[PDB]
Amino acid sequence: WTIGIINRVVQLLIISYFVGWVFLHEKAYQVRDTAIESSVVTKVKGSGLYANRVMDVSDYVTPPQGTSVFVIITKMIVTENQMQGFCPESEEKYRCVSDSQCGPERLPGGGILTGRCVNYSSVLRTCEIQGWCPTEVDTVETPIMMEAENFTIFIKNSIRFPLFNFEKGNLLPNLTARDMKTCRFHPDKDPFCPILRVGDVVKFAGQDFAKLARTGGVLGIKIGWVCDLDKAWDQCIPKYSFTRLDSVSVSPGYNFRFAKYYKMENGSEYRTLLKAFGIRFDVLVYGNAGKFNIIPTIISSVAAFTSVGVGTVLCDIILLNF
Amino acid sequence: WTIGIINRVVQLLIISYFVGWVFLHEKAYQVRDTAIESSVVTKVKGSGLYANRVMDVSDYVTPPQGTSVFVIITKMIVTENQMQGFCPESEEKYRCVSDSQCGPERLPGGGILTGRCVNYSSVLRTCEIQGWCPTEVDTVETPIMMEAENFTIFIKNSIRFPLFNFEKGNLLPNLTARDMKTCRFHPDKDPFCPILRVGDVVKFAGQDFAKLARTGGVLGIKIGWVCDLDKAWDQCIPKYSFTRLDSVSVSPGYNFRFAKYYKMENGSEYRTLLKAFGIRFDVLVYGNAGKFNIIPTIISSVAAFTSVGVGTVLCDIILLNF
Amino acid sequence: WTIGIINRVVQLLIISYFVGWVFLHEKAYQVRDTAIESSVVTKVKGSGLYANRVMDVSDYVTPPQGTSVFVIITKMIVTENQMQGFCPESEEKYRCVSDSQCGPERLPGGGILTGRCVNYSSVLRTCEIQGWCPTEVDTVETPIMMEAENFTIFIKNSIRFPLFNFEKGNLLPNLTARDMKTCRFHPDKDPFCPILRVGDVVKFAGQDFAKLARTGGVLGIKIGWVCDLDKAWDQCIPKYSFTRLDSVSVSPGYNFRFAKYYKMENGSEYRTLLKAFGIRFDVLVYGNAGKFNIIPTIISSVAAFTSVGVGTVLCDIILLNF
Numbered sequence: 001w002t003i004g005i006i007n008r009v010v011q012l013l014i015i016s017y018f019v020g021w022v023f024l025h026e027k028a029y030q031v032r033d034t035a036i037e038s039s040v041v042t043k044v045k046g047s048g049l050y051a052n053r054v055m056d057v058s059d060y061v062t063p064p065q066g067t068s069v070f071v072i073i074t075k076m077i078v079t080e081n082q083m084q085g086f087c088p089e090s091e092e093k094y095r096c097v098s099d100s101q102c103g104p105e106r107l108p109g110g111g112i113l114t115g116r117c118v119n120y121s122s123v124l125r126t127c128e129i130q131g132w133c134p135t136e137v138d139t140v141e142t143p144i145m146m147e148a149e150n151f152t153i154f155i156k157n158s159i160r161f162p163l164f165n166f167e168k169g170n171l172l173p174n175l176t177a178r179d180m181k182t183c184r185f186h187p188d189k190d191p192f193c194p195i196l197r198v199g200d201v202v203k204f205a206g207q208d209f210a211k212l213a214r215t216g217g218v219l220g221i222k223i224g225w226v227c228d229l230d231k232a233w234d235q236c237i238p239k240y241s242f243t244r245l246d247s248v249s250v251s252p253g254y255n256f257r258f259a260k261y262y263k264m265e266n267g268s269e270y271r272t273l274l275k276a277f278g279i280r281f282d283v284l285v286y287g288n289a290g291k292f293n294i295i296p297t298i299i300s301s302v303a304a305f306t307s308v309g310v311g312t313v314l315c316d317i318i319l320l321n322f
Numbered sequence: 323w324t325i326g327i328i329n330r331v332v333q334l335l336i337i338s339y340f341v342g343w344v345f346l347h348e349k350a351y352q353v354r355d356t357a358i359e360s361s362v363v364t365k366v367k368g369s370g371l372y373a374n375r376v377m378d379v380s381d382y383v384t385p386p387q388g389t390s391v392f393v394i395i396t397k398m399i400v401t402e403n404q405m406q407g408f409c410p411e412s413e414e415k416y417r418c419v420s421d422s423q424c425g426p427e428r429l430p431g432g433g434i435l436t437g438r439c440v441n442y443s444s445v446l447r448t449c450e451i452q453g454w455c456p457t458e459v460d461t462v463e464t465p466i467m468m469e470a471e472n473f474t475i476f477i478k479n480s481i482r483f484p485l486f487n488f489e490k491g492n493l494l495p496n497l498t499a500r501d502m503k504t505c506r507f508h509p510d511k512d513p514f515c516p517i518l519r520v521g522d523v524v525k526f527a528g529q530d531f532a533k534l535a536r537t538g539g540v541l542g543i544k545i546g547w548v549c550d551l552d553k554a555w556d557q558c559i560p561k562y563s564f565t566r567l568d569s570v571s572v573s574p575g576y577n578f579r580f581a582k583y584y585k586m587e588n589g590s591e592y593r594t595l596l597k598a599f600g601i602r603f604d605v606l607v608y609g610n611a612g613k614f615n616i617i618p619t620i621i622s623s624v625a626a627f628t629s630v631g632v633g634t635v636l637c638d639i640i641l642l643n644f
Numbered sequence: 645w646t647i648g649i650i651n652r653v654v655q656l657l658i659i660s661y662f663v664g665w666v667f668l669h670e671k672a673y674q675v676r677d678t679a680i681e682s683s684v685v686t687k688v689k690g691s692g693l694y695a696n697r698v699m700d701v702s703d704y705v706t707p708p709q710g711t712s713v714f715v716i717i718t719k720m721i722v723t724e725n726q727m728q729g730f731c732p733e734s735e736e737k738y739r740c741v742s743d744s745q746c747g748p749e750r751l752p753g754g755g756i757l758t759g760r761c762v763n764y765s766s767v768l769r770t771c772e773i774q775g776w777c778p779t780e781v782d783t784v785e786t787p788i789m790m791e792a793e794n795f796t797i798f799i800k801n802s803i804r805f806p807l808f809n810f811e812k813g814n815l816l817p818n819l820t821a822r823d824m825k826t827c828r829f830h831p832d833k834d835p836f837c838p839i840l841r842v843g844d845v846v847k848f849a850g851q852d853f854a855k856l857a858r859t860g861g862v863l864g865i866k867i868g869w870v871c872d873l874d875k876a877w878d879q880c881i882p883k884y885s886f887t888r889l890d891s892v893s894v895s896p897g898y899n900f901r902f903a904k905y906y907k908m909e910n911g912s913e914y915r916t917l918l919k920a921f922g923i924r925f926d927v928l929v930y931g932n933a934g935k936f937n938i939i940p941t942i943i944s945s946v947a948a949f950t951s952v953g954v955g956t957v958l959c960d961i962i963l964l965n966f
């Protein structure tokens with residue numbers, strides 16, 4: 001009966017269209033490269049005011065070289081002119097009553113205890129320690145450099161898909177509405193401007209510059225490179241997303257210590273101990289490309305052929321049986 | 323004969339179970355993401371004693387920001403108060419007899435030679451050089467800061483599987499037997515404590531803190547994120563492994579030079595030249611996840627179908643022929 | 645007719661050889677690992693002359709620790725002895741006529757403006773600013789440290805393929821024609837020498853050390869690890885390639901600012917502001933290995949079987965029809 005092949009031909013048409021759109025949708029005919037080889041170079045611009053001092057790129061930016069990870073110092077605690085010596089630590093947790101509870105057995109991971117219970121002040125008695133004297137008082141409150149919000153982060157990214165030897169950069173003057181020296185990344189009005197306003201990045205990650213500058217934090221300028229190398233070089237485009245990575249028992253925020261080391265005319269050594277709070281930026285470059293390949297096109301093809309081949313039989317069984 | 327389909331039905335049962343367990347075992351039905359997007363933040367705590375000086379985080383930790391790569395200085399060679407000038411180098415390899423063998427042709431990659439053969443001491447005659455005077459004597463023996471062993475490395479890691487947009491952190495208070503502020507990673511008793519005792523990491527990598535602190539070395543806190551995103555968020559868990567990366571013609575160990583730069587009241591410049599030996603830590607974040615997908619489930623399915631389909635024929639040939 | 649199976653047997657022979665060589669060529673029987681876990685340690689050696697000063701590793705290398713990203717300073721602009729204070733900026737773009745155009749509305753991202761239009765010199769009138777005084781004059785011309793060309797970059801790389809737990813290093817004394825302490829990477833005469841002459845790397849990337857040292861730049865020592873773990877450990881070998889990553893509205897080159905911070909006997913603070921130009925090196929470690937696997941061998945096998953199975957029919961149709 002001719003209806004049997006019009007039933008069969010219909011079977012083939014429908015089933016094969018479903019399969020075809022599914023595999024055509026998932027690019028099963030494509031091999032994929034997911035090991036993006038990126039190089040990141042960053043440049044920060046801005047000047048701020050902290051106390052009655054002006055902070056510039058050399059002052060609040062560390063490291064200075066512009067790696068994929070860099071810090072903009074917003075707040076900082078200065079313990080000026082420390083000197084190797086003996087002095088009572090200021091932390092209440094070192095509170096003692098007698099030199100009997102200031103032995104090595106107490107606070108092992110801590111600083112170096114002399115073994116004397118000394119009077120830091122009249123209201124606290126703490127174990128004495130050898131080290132940079134006097135000790136740091138990390139419990140006071142200090143201002144934050146608000147100008148940092150208008151600072152700007154320029155991200156130049158040069159990536160390479162090595163499986164296809166397809167290298168490209170994120171500087172695209174045609175894709176940017178404005179000039180490169182003056183544009184400013186807006187996810188909508190200019191999503192390819194490589195210049196990000198700090199405060200902008202803070203918002204894109206959904207965070208408040210006040211609390212963030214106060215406690216410090218870690219943000220991620222995520223650069224995504226999802227590309228179809230079957231298409232044009234013009235189509236491999238970077239998409240910027242933004243997220244906070246520290247999120248959140250443990251106290252949020254981010255701070256590190258570094259000393260400026262000065263020496264005296266007679267030769268004794270002294271340093272300015274700096275506990276720095278700021279915003280660390282991590283440029284996370286992800287990317288994956290896909291090219292037409294003979295092999296995955298063939299495994300996907302075989303898959304589709306056999307699949308439709310069983311579908312038409314099971315459907316003959318379901319229709320006939322009904 | 324009904325035995326033919328009981329022979330055939332048995333064929334199908336057995337062969338199909340083998341194939342089924344193999345593919346079910348290898349998760350061939352799953353697509354996999356192997357491009358983990360990790361952010362690493364580290365914090366070291368401890369104080370040590372070196373000579374009659376106390377070293378703290380600002381002193382022995384570099385860089386101070388807590389990147390994925392950081393150094394804990396254990397030993398260091400100080401050449402204090404160098405000054406641009408002329409002086410005889412101290413290395414025997416620069417030994418000369420006359421200014422005839424101290425020409426540019428000799429030791430090209432080396433320092434800057436003046437061309438004079440001068441008497442460094444009474445027992446060595448070396449070519450004179452222009453630079454930081456006096457020269458470094460990197461052949462003496464110095465102590466090591468043993469307290470570093472009790473120092474602690476806190477690793478906060480925030481990773482993201484971008485193919486499934488599955489981000490998660492390694493801070494897991496439920497998975498940790500003790501509190502987070504006080505736990506200590508033990509591969510067995512607390513394998514999810516993010517705090518690693520330095521000496522502990524040294525042992526997990528199978529190394530002796532004495533020789534290591536003496537010569538310096540490179541260790542890897544490997545964080546593995548093998549995950550089945552078909553399963554629960556609770557199942558994506560990090561596994562910490564540890565390894566030494568420098569291993570091993572070339573001299574083992576690890577050392578770098580940095581100068582503390584000081585200036586004089588009259589304006590001449592002088593620096594403290596520091597050859598630092600220590601332990602570099604590299605947090606190597608690896609990870610791969612797998613989710614059920616229609617496409618790999620289909621290619622794997624087709625594979626299994628055709629495979630069993632040929633197996634039953636070859637087995638009919640082997641049984642019948644016998 | 646026996647010719648039908650000699651036609652069919654020929655069909656099978658030819659078609660199956662084509663398919664077989666194609667899949668055997670693409671290693672479809674192999675699973676692949678593309679997430680290389682590399683550790684990079686670098687060491688630079690050399691001394692150069694800048695002005696009448698000698699620069700050594702501690703002077704021109706930053707950071708000093710030898711990460712995967714490091715800078716060799718070739719040129720630098722010194723603004724010595726800056727001091728918080730008030731002074732007219734020197735950039736023409738801050739040119740003013742009256743204090744009316746030196747309000748916060750002007751040059752928002754810039755430094756901190758006092759609001760006074762002051763006379764920097766007799767030929768320029770600029771807005772006054774609070775900060776490090778005097779201001780930087782980044783428009784003059786300075787020399788470059790040419791010795792840097794003969795400097796040497798030693799790259800020790802320890803990678804790990806985690807899907808197969810296959811770790812290995814790039815130090816291969818057997819593969820190197822000469823000793824390790826004295827070899828020098830030549831793509832041809834010694835492609836496994838881990839020591840790269842700076843100038844050499846500059847050439848391999850197709851660049852001129854003069855213009856590059858003048859304006860600074862970013863180069864990539866690309867280490868490739870393409871490996872067949874079905875083969876011997878001796879066959880997993882690294883291949884060094886070289887490329888310039890900044891390439892190229894925006895001004896080429898690379899420069900960053902850092903200050904050396906000095907303090908006075910009476911306590912006022914002053915710094916040497918350094919705008920550094922040099923060559924940044926990025927060791928880009930890529931790698932992918934492939935091992936024989938049951939699963940991809942099976943999907944590829946099924947693929948080939950069905951494929952040839954349809955080929956012989958379409959060819960019977962093409963031959964018969966002809």
Ligand SMILES: *[C@@H]1O[C@H](CO)[C@@H](O)[C@H](O)[C@H]1NC(C)=O
Pocket residue numbers: 104105108468469471472
């Ligand atoms: C580490 O601390 C313990 C106290 O908790 C102490 O007994 C031990 O001596 C310390 N280790 C070193 C090497 O000082």
Ligand SMILES: *[C@@H]1O[C@H](CO)[C@@H](O)[C@H](O)[C@H]1NC(C)=O
Pocket residue numbers: 174234
């Ligand atoms: C950039 O713009 C010019 C127009 O002058 C065009 O010819 C060129 O193809 C564009 N390049 C890309 C990569 O779009």
Ligand SMILES: *[C@@H]1O[C@H](CO)[C@@H](O)[C@H](O)[C@H]1NC(C)=O
Pocket residue numbers: 264266267268
């Ligand atoms: C150096 O001078 C300071 C005060 O000027 C003094 O406190 C210190 O003890 C001196 N150094 C030595 C080794 O006496």
Ligand SMILES: *[C@@H]1O[C@H](CO)[C@@H](O)[C@H](O)[C@H]1NC(C)=O
Pocket residue numbers: 426427430790791793794
């Ligand atoms: C590099 O060293 C050689 C000696 O090995 C010397 O002849 C040459 O001039 C040096 N290159 C530069 C740029 O100084």
Ligand SMILES: *[C@@H]1O[C@H](CO)[C@@H](O)[C@H](O)[C@H]1NC(C)=O
Pocket residue numbers: 496556
């Ligand atoms: C953590 O513990 C609480 C118990 O109070 C539990 O409800 C929660 O689901 C746990 N979270 C995870 C991720 O296990």
Ligand SMILES: *[C@@H]1O[C@H](CO)[C@@H](O)[C@H](O)[C@H]1NC(C)=O
Pocket residue numbers: 586588589590
């Ligand atoms: C600065 O003073 C030191 C000793 O105080 C002296 O050696 C040096 O020559 C002086 N600087 C100059 C340029 O003379």
Ligand SMILES: *[C@@H]1O[C@H](CO)[C@@H](O)[C@H](O)[C@H]1NC(C)=O
Pocket residue numbers: 146147149150748749752
């Ligand atoms: C940022 O700059 C604008 C001028 O463009 C200024 O009005 C605004 O107050 C600045 N933001 C902060 C936080 O100072």
Ligand SMILES: *[C@@H]1O[C@H](CO)[C@@H](O)[C@H](O)[C@H]1NC(C)=O
Pocket residue numbers: 818878
């Ligand atoms: C290195 O050379 C020695 C020859 O003494 C040889 O026995 C050894 O197998 C070689 N190792 C490799 C990895 O080629």
Ligand SMILES: *[C@@H]1O[C@H](CO)[C@@H](O)[C@H](O)[C@H]1NC(C)=O
Pocket residue numbers: 908910911912
């Ligand atoms: C410190 O001395 C310098 C000159 O020696 C002077 O310019 C400065 O004003 C002094 N510091 C203070 C706070 O007066």
Ligand SMILES: [Mg+2]
Pocket residue numbers: 091135136137138
């Ligand atoms: Mg304290």
Ligand SMILES: [Mg+2]
Pocket residue numbers: 413457458459460
């Ligand atoms: Mg020496």
Ligand SMILES: [Mg+2]
Pocket residue numbers: 735779780781782
């Ligand atoms: Mg300027």
Ligand code: NA
Pocket residue numbers: 299300302303621622624625943944946947
């Ligand atoms: Na298949």
